[PDB]
Amino acid sequence: LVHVASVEKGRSYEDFQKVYNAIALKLREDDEYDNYIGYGPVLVRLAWHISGTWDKHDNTGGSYGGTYRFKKEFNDPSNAGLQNGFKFLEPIHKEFPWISSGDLFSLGGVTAVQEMQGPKIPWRCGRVDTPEDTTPDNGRLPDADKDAGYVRTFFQRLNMNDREVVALMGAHALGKTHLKNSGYEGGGANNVFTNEFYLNLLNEDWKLEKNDANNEQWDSKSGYMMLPTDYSLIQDPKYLSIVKEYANDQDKFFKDFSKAFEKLLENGITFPKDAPSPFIFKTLEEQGL
Numbered sequence: 001l002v003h004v005a006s007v008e009k010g011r012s013y014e015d016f017q018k019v020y021n022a023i024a025l026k027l028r029e030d031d032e033y034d035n036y037i038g039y040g041p042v043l044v045r046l047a048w049h050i051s052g053t054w055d056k057h058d059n060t061g062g063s064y065g066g067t068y069r070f071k072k073e074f075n076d077p078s079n080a081g082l083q084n085g086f087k088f089l090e091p092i093h094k095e096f097p098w099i100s101s102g103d104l105f106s107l108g109g110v111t112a113v114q115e116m117q118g119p120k121i122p123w124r125c126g127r128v129d130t131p132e133d134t135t136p137d138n139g140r141l142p143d144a145d146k147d148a149g150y151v152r153t154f155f156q157r158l159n160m161n162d163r164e165v166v167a168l169m170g171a172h173a174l175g176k177t178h179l180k181n182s183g184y185e186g187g188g189a190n191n192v193f194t195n196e197f198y199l200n201l202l203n204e205d206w207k208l209e210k211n212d213a214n215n216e217q218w219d220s221k222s223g224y225m226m227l228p229t230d231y232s233l234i235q236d237p238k239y240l241s242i243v244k245e246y247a248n249d250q251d252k253f254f255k256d257f258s259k260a261f262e263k264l265l266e267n268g269i270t271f272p273k274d275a276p277s278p279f280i281f282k283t284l285e286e287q288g289l
């Protein structure tokens with residue numbers, strides 16, 4: 001199954017930078033969401049979940065087809081809460097109706113990471129919307145109540161290795177869990193992209209507790225939480241090494257996250273040899289906007 005990137009007709013970097021800018025300006029404007037976290041984190045999660053359905057064995061799922069717009073996928077229990085991200089992006093899509101749905105969703109994630117002071121994420125256009133019957137079934141996104149072996153195995157389906165898994169998980173510095181979405185209870189409130197997930201894993205005094213949904217999670221007296229799968233990265237000795245690395249090298253963590261996130265967003269897509277080079281968008285701050 002081959003998905004060839006096809007550039008939205010006549011569009012170039014300047015067009016996509018405007019889209020970026022509209023998302024970034026809305027991020028700035030719609031500040032009260034989720035107790036003043038803003039929409040950055042949920043947009044990152046959205047870009048991950050639209051990509052994380054991919055199966056390297058048959059090239060089903062993945063970001064390309066924009067299939068999150070179809071009820072089967074948007075109603076996936078694993079996607080509960082992401083409707084907020086969608087509603088955020090709908091006015092952007094109405095203003096720029098020419099962008100494909102997979103391009104918009106993945107660009108929303110790029111824009112969110114950058115505007116939250118994360119690394120640059122090169123991004124490529126050309127995802128093309130595919131029909132409802134190409135929507136992957138529910139159940140391809142990961143469970144949070146398991147160990148390191150589950151995590152490793154899960155991510156082989158996405159062609160991610162240990163360093164890529166540990167790097168991508170660093171996005172769990174952002175935002176929070178919400179009991180009514182996932183059964184995890186978060187207070188958390190960060191909307192700045194840093195390497196603190198790793199620092200928190202190593203530094204905090206974690207206690208295995210049960211939340212009000214009767215699920216276990218790891219909590220600290222500082223008010224932080226970790227999912228069991230987040231904690232598994234310090235149980236497994238191969239993941240632990242890499243957690244320590246990223247805790248001790250902000251820059252390394254940035255570059256590794258950038259390449260892993262781009263790869264995640266691009267899995268399943270064939271880029272023609274004549275395709276444009278990846279775009280690196282300027283932040284609002286960089287533009288003086």
Ligand code: HEM
Pocket residue numbers: 041042044045048080081142143144145151168169171172174175176177178179181182183184227229261
């Ligand atoms: C083992 C892998 C993963 C598991 C089990 C997992 C699980 C979860 C769960 C249960 C939540 C809370 C959802 C809610 O209650 O609203 C969450 C949130 C979040 N996840 Fe993950 N995740 C994983 C990997 C990733 C990856 C790879 C990324 C992106 C690179 C990501 C980005 C996020 C973000 C940014 C949030 C916060 C959303 C918000 O604040 O609304 N996660 N994840």
Ligand SMILES: Nc1cccc[n+]1CCO
Pocket residue numbers: 145146147148227228229231232235
């Ligand atoms: N080690 C383990 C065993 C079972 C479920 C989850 N985890 C991960 C951390 O709590």
Ligand SMILES: Nc1cccc[n+]1CCO
Pocket residue numbers: 172173174175176177186188197200224225226227230
């Ligand atoms: N662990 C986790 C997972 C997802 C979002 C937030 N947090 C808390 C901060 O690390």
